[PDB]
Write a protein that binds this ligand. Sequence first.
Ligand SMILES: *[C@@H]1O[C@H](CO)[C@@H](O[C@@H]2O[C@H](CO)[C@@H](O)[C@H](O)[C@H]2NC(C)=O)[C@H](O)[C@H]1NC(C)=O
Ligand SMILES: *[C@@H]1O[C@H](CO)[C@@H](O[C@@H]2O[C@H](CO)[C@@H](O)[C@H](O)[C@H]2NC(C)=O)[C@H](O)[C@H]1NC(C)=O
Ligand SMILES: *[C@@H]1O[C@H](CO)[C@@H](O[C@@H]2O[C@H](CO)[C@@H](O)[C@H](O)[C@H]2NC(C)=O)[C@H](O)[C@H]1NC(C)=O
Ligand SMILES: *[C@@H]1O[C@H](CO)[C@@H](O[C@@H]2O[C@H](CO)[C@@H](O)[C@H](O)[C@H]2NC(C)=O)[C@H](O)[C@H]1NC(C)=O
Ligand SMILES: *[C@@H]1O[C@H](CO)[C@@H](O[C@@H]2O[C@H](CO)[C@@H](O)[C@H](O)[C@H]2NC(C)=O)[C@H](O)[C@H]1NC(C)=O
Ligand SMILES: *[C@@H]1O[C@H](CO)[C@@H](O[C@@H]2O[C@H](CO)[C@@H](O)[C@H](O)[C@H]2NC(C)=O)[C@H](O)[C@H]1NC(C)=O
Ligand SMILES: *[C@@H]1O[C@H](CO)[C@@H](O[C@@H]2O[C@H](CO)[C@@H](O)[C@H](O)[C@H]2NC(C)=O)[C@H](O)[C@H]1NC(C)=O
Ligand SMILES: *[C@@H]1O[C@H](CO)[C@@H](O[C@@H]2O[C@H](CO)[C@@H](O)[C@H](O)[C@H]2NC(C)=O)[C@H](O)[C@H]1NC(C)=O
Ligand SMILES: *[C@@H]1O[C@H](CO)[C@@H](O)[C@H](O)[C@H]1NC(C)=O
Ligand SMILES: *[C@@H]1O[C@H](CO)[C@@H](O)[C@H](O)[C@H]1NC(C)=O
Ligand SMILES: *[C@@H]1O[C@H](CO)[C@@H](O)[C@H](O)[C@H]1NC(C)=O
Ligand SMILES: *[C@@H]1O[C@H](CO)[C@@H](O)[C@H](O)[C@H]1NC(C)=O
Lengths: 164, 119, 310, 49, 49
Amino acid sequence: NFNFNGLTGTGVLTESNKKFLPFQQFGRDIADTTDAVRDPQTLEILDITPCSFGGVSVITPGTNTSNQVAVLYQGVNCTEVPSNVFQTRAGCLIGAEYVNNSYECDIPIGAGICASYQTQSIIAYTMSLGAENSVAYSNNSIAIPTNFTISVTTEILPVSMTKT
Amino acid sequence: KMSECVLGQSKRVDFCGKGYHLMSFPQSAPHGVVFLHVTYVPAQEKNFTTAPAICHDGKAHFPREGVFVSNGTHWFVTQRNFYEPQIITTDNTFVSGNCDVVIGIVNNTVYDPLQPELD
Amino acid sequence: SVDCTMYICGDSTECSNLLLQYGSFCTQLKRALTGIAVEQDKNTQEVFAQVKQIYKTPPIKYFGGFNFSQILPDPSKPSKRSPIEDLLFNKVKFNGLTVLPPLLTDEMIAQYTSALLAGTITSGWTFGAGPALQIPFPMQMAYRFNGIGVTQNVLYENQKLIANQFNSAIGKIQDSLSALGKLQDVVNHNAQALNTLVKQLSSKFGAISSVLNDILSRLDPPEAEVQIDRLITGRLQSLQTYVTQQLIRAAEIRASANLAATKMSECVLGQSKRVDFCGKGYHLMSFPQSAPHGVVFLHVTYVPAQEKNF
Amino acid sequence: SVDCTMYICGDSTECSNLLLQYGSFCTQLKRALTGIAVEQDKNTQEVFA
Amino acid sequence: LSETKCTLKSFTVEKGIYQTSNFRVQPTESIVRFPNITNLCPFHEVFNA
Ligand SMILES: *[C@@H]1O[C@H](CO)[C@@H](O[C@@H]2O[C@H](CO)[C@@H](O)[C@H](O)[C@H]2NC(C)=O)[C@H](O)[C@H]1NC(C)=O
Ligand SMILES: *[C@@H]1O[C@H](CO)[C@@H](O[C@@H]2O[C@H](CO)[C@@H](O)[C@H](O)[C@H]2NC(C)=O)[C@H](O)[C@H]1NC(C)=O
Ligand SMILES: *[C@@H]1O[C@H](CO)[C@@H](O[C@@H]2O[C@H](CO)[C@@H](O)[C@H](O)[C@H]2NC(C)=O)[C@H](O)[C@H]1NC(C)=O
Ligand SMILES: *[C@@H]1O[C@H](CO)[C@@H](O[C@@H]2O[C@H](CO)[C@@H](O)[C@H](O)[C@H]2NC(C)=O)[C@H](O)[C@H]1NC(C)=O
Ligand SMILES: *[C@@H]1O[C@H](CO)[C@@H](O[C@@H]2O[C@H](CO)[C@@H](O)[C@H](O)[C@H]2NC(C)=O)[C@H](O)[C@H]1NC(C)=O
Ligand SMILES: *[C@@H]1O[C@H](CO)[C@@H](O[C@@H]2O[C@H](CO)[C@@H](O)[C@H](O)[C@H]2NC(C)=O)[C@H](O)[C@H]1NC(C)=O
Ligand SMILES: *[C@@H]1O[C@H](CO)[C@@H](O[C@@H]2O[C@H](CO)[C@@H](O)[C@H](O)[C@H]2NC(C)=O)[C@H](O)[C@H]1NC(C)=O
Ligand SMILES: *[C@@H]1O[C@H](CO)[C@@H](O[C@@H]2O[C@H](CO)[C@@H](O)[C@H](O)[C@H]2NC(C)=O)[C@H](O)[C@H]1NC(C)=O
Ligand SMILES: *[C@@H]1O[C@H](CO)[C@@H](O)[C@H](O)[C@H]1NC(C)=O
Ligand SMILES: *[C@@H]1O[C@H](CO)[C@@H](O)[C@H](O)[C@H]1NC(C)=O
Ligand SMILES: *[C@@H]1O[C@H](CO)[C@@H](O)[C@H](O)[C@H]1NC(C)=O
Ligand SMILES: *[C@@H]1O[C@H](CO)[C@@H](O)[C@H](O)[C@H]1NC(C)=O
């Protein structure tokens, strides 16, 4: 919590590498927020970055399966959170182990990272896209079906809501 | 969807189910509607070898509504979605041109039904 | 996502107890914004994840001629995008405000689009109705000429000319590219609507000042609560305006992603007879490419030329 | 279109300077109303031309 | 798990992923920066003449 001869603010202070003109005190961003200052006594430029905030999410396999839980701190660097600590493009995940396998998605974490209660507890590791089919294409080959199946599926659509 | 899947047969892909639309049935729900889509799905495929045309007597023959296929040694015509091979005759093929402009022509005999029967 | 309490009050504690008196106004706004964010991932799942398997093109890569090299993936890249998808991607913390990342990376989106492309080039329209059944590309092109009412020897006797015309038309697209204003407009309107919400924090709405410390710092509680309630009223009105417009703007993006899903089904996974749904002319086939926050469809059509009278 | 300032104040400077304490409400309102006047010409260009 | 049950207002949560709260680092101490000092009143001549 800082006060630079009038400028009151909060944040992390860091050594800069910008160069003010020798009469300018602080710098502003587009959308007009203070993002640099000059220290009056030593006259050096320091950047002002905001601290760290973010949502907290809880990943559960369902209380009818287990009571273990994993926790996602969203877009927080996993070194400033307060076992399994795992860093994701979506935040820091605690309480799930990261495996190297891959096949489908169960609980979506983000940025191609999913979790499941398998190997159980909570885990993190994308969710893949789908199987892998390899068509034997050639310049004189064809495949023709010899049988069929009759299939029937459903589709549900809302038409109305309640008149109040 | 009630107009195009229940009172008709749709050709639009993936509009009345997944597969080839045969028919649809409506059912009422609390504040909406359920469609039951009946579609055809092909199954159990085999590979064969194909050609675009058949050369015979210096002419190029194309199938009227099918594909030319080969089981390894013989040449037939099927319809494209269900395997049902037929002898290539002048009743299920048509002619246009000579057989040196198409690429992939194969040599095979096209059977004339009148020629023997008459004689 | 906006934290209602941190945008309004913001650190101060005299403001949180006063805002607690308004009920569930801030819970509603967070629900409204969270619904919008969950809808944006379903938009993308509905447009792009329209394929069971991840199909691959064969190594030889020779479609009896036709040349698809500018739209197939580039193996010498971390992103594995195509040449035209690389052209398209070079043309397009605060007071409680946060940006969440999409569930699908755009590597994943490029991987869905290349599989849709290899399904089409190798199996025609059979992979959209069941298992992929290979067919040679010239014969698939001849099936499609039948679908527009042309007899199929017109293709086989003109194969080289038809392949050259396709190749030149594909070459002209990069030059016409190296347009995307419909994708820039969405980004611009959203950034500009987010800039106004932040600028609305330096307004006094009829209080002495617009900074929650100086207001109190120069007065008692009985006298400051009056000004802080005016500040609260203005800042809550601004946030409601913002959220209502995001709700109206997301329903417009959803109607567009719904049109894209229908086009991907009907112009890429099949051949359409609907007039002008897949370009001008008689629809032959269509190819998808991923753009930032969007999709590009390259429609191949047949246009008649050089008529005589009889 | 509606001029937001002339609707609220209507040729009065005492009211206009007090209206400046709310920020960009009238700019927002005019921008919203103009964007739906531009959409109407696009609507009939897309049907008839 | 209990914070999730409270967020949903239920005693049975079905499988999924739920946003439950937020993590905000905490700041300690308040550093007040400022400038040096100007001339000091010449009190030494009025008192020491
Ligand atoms: C404000 O005063 C401090 C000292 O009270 C000055 O700090 C001096 O900075 C010079 C650098 O040119 C050093 O060589 C001195 O040793 C520093 N003095 C002390 C006591 O640390 C500071 O420079 C002054 N502010 C300005 C703008 O000159
Ligand atoms: C086509 O597929 C059907 C299955 O859908 C085959 O019929 C099945 O045959 C097995 C073995 O004879 C029986 O156990 C099943 O009861 C049959 N299913 C039904 C629904 O009757 C049929 O034989 C296949 N046809 C060909 C030519 O392969
Ligand atoms: C069609 O023929 C191809 C060519 O052999 C078959 O595809 C190969 O199948 C084997 C065994 O499943 C694989 O190991 C190869 O990788 C496949 N691809 C090749 C050789 O390019 C395919 O199974 C045949 N299809 C049917 C329906 O019988
Ligand atoms: C391709 O199909 C033909 C069917 O016309 C097969 O040839 C016949 O096979 C039957 C039974 O083996 C014999 O009774 C006939 O004499 C054969 N010839 C004719 C003209 O009918 C042929 O064997 C099949 N080839 C393969 C590789 O399966
Ligand atoms: C298909 O049949 C034609 C006619 O029977 C073949 O043409 C002959 O090919 C031989 C060998 O190349 C030549 O010596 C003859 O002069 C050709 N005759 C004519 C009229 O062109 C043709 O080669 C056959 N195709 C294949 C692949 O065997
Ligand atoms: C497919 O088309 C591309 C053009 O977009 C071909 O690549 C170019 O080929 C010309 C000569 O034909 C070269 O001068 C260019 O440098 C090539 N551009 C590249 C490699 O980026 C490509 O060869 C065509 N494919 C085939 C199989 O011919
Ligand atoms: C087919 O014939 C018609 C004429 O019957 C051509 O239209 C003529 O074009 C000339 C020059 O533009 C006009 O001066 C005539 O008035 C037109 N005729 C009529 C009846 O209006 C038409 O261009 C011809 N098209 C082709 C492909 O030959
Ligand atoms: C008032 O004036 C007297 C004399 O001018 C100051 O006395 C000086 O004190 C310092 C420190 O004790 C000595 O180093 C000097 O030698 C003294 N001066 C003489 C002439 O002896 C006294 O300091 C002054 N008062 C103040 C408050 O500064
Ligand atoms: C939920 O519990 C019931 C009974 O305890 C059990 O039959 C059912 O399989 C459970 N569901 C899951 C998903 O485990
Ligand atoms: C977290 O901070 C450390 C220390 O600077 C840094 O090495 C790491 O890269 C940061 N996290 C991310 C995701 O960059
Ligand atoms: C996953 O595979 C990589 C291969 O580069 C390896 O380095 C890593 O140790 C593996 N992870 C685990 C948990 O075994
Ligand atoms: C198919 O490719 C083979 C190469 O294995 C070549 O010999 C043949 O001429 C080609 N035929 C057609 C019809 O493209």
